[PDB]
């Protein structure tokens, strides 16, 4: 997920499950192969001392300026209409600039996102509908125009983009502590046998 060949769109964000293994969270922190890394509630170096019931990784690509919307208690086009996180989010977020990988001459039109929606999304909700955003009383009849708008639009990921517009391969690592037992606990230290 940190080095995937292809990422799903933001409004069509994918999710991968992580369980039944040993998870080394210190490799990413010390790999220095990212642009931004922040954990909420827990330090990145201490996650190896903590196992959880379930761990999910929501993968997608967003612009540099849109990275601020991905955090608990934020709002915006990406936070409300594409991918929302709860106020009590205690996971981690990793971001890596992919301008040398995902940028295309004329923009990478495969990565798209929603700009408007009839209602705000819930935490960890997805919506890939193509409904026309209706504002007025008249019906849109499957075409945008006066008081009607096609909500999805493509990204302008060109090689000439700036820091605020370049593509960034972002992954949101969420943790879950349920009544069910643990499934993935970090690597434990070892020493010689005296």
């Amino acid at each position: 997920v940190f080095n995937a060949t292809r990422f799903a769109s933001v409004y069509a964000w994918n999710r991968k499950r992580i369980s039944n293994c040993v998870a080394d969270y210190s490799v990413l922190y010390n790999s220095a192969s990212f642009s931004t890394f922040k954990c909420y509630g827990v330090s990145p170096t201490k996650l190896n001392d903590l196992c959880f019931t379930n761990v999910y990784a929501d993968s997608f690509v967003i612009r540099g300026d849109e990275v601020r919307q991905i955090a608990p208690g934020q709002t915006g086009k990406i936070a409300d209409y594409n991918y929302k996180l709860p106020d009590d989010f205690t996971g981690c977020v990793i971001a890596w600039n992919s301008n040398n990988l995902d940028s295309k001459v004329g923009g990478n039109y495969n990565y798209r996102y929603r700009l408007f929606r009839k209602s705000n999304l819930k935490p960890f909700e997805r919506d890939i509908s193509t409904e026309i955003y209706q504002a007025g009383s008249k019906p849109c009849n499957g075409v945008e125009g006066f008081n009607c708008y096609f909500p999805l639009q493509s990204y302008g990921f060109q090689p000439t983009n700036g820091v605020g517009y370049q593509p960034y391969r972002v992954v949101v690592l969420s943790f879950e502590l349920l009544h069910a037992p643990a499934t993935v606990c970090g690597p434990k230290k070892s020493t010689n046998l005296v």
Partner: peptide, 28 residues
Amino acid sequence: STIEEQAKTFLDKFNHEAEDLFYQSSLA
């Protein structure tokens, strides 16, 4: 709901489409 959403959504549509179109002329 109100008429105000038309201009706000219309300009947002133009601001997204006019942006890359103008840069293509500026870049050329």
